[PDB]
Paper text:
In addition, we also solved the structure of a variant lacking the C-terminal helix altogether, that is, containing only the structural elements of the canonical p53 tetramerization domain motif. Deletion of the H2 helix has been shown to substantially destabilize the [name] and p73 tetramers, and much higher protein concentrations were needed to shift the equilibrium toward tetrameric species. We solved the crystal structure of such a truncated variant of [name], [name](359–388), at a resolution of 1.9 Å. Interestingly, this crystal structure, solved in the space group P1, contained one tetramer in the asymmetric unit but with fundamentally different packing characteristics than those observed for the longer variant. The primary dimers are formed as observed for the longer variant, that is, by formation of an intermolecular β-sheet and antiparallel packing of the H1 helices. These primary dimers, however, pack in an antiparallel fashion to form tetramers, which is in stark contrast to the orthogonal packing observed in the full-length tetramers of p53, [name] and p73. In addition, there are small differences in the structure of the primary dimers, most notably, a difference in packing angle and conformation of the H1 helix. This helix adopts an α-helical conformation throughout, whereas the packing interactions in the full-length variant cause a distortion at the C-terminal end of the helix and a transition to a 310-helical conformation. Key hydrophobic interactions at the center of the primary dimer interface are conserved. Hence, loss of the second helix in [name] and p73 not only weakens the tetramer but also fundamentally alters the overall orientation of the H1 helix packing, revealing a high degree of fluidity of this interface in the absence of the H2 helix.
The transcription factors p53, [name] and p73 play an important role in cancer prevention, development and longevity. The three proteins share a similar domain organization, being composed of structured DNA-binding domain (DBD) and tetramerization domain flanked by intrinsically disordered regions. Tetramers are formed via a short tetramerization domain that follows the DBD, with a short flexible linker region separating the two domains. Here, we report crystal structures of different [name] tetramerization domain variants, showing not only marked similarity to p73 but also small differences that may be important for regulating the function of [name] in vivo.
Numbering used by the authors:
A (entry chain A): 360 to 388
B (entry chain C): 361 to 388
C (entry chain B): 361 to 387
D (entry chain D): 361 to 386
The structure:
Amino acid sequence: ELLYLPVRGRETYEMLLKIKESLELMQYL
Amino acid sequence: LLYLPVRGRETYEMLLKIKESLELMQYL
Amino acid sequence: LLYLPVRGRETYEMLLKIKESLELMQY
Amino acid sequence: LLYLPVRGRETYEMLLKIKESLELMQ
């Protein structure tokens, strides 16, 4: 199962979504 | 209130720290 | 301005991305 | 060693704490 991180607000959510993507790349490299 | 799906627990914890920081930036 | 010390290309580039989001939260 | 320019002490300190967590992680 995925983990589900609670977030308030679409602004913050979208930022974290983008950073997540970068972190996942980092962790694979 | 939204829920961001995350695969790794390491990613999850880092995102949790960044979220805390983003929340506090909203004060400035 | 302050100047954050960073060692390593990868870390610098990640912090640059996180910096952008931190700063945009104000707006 | 590189220096990332940042407007404002609060953002700078936030980024320092994040850097330590990032470095720990990787």
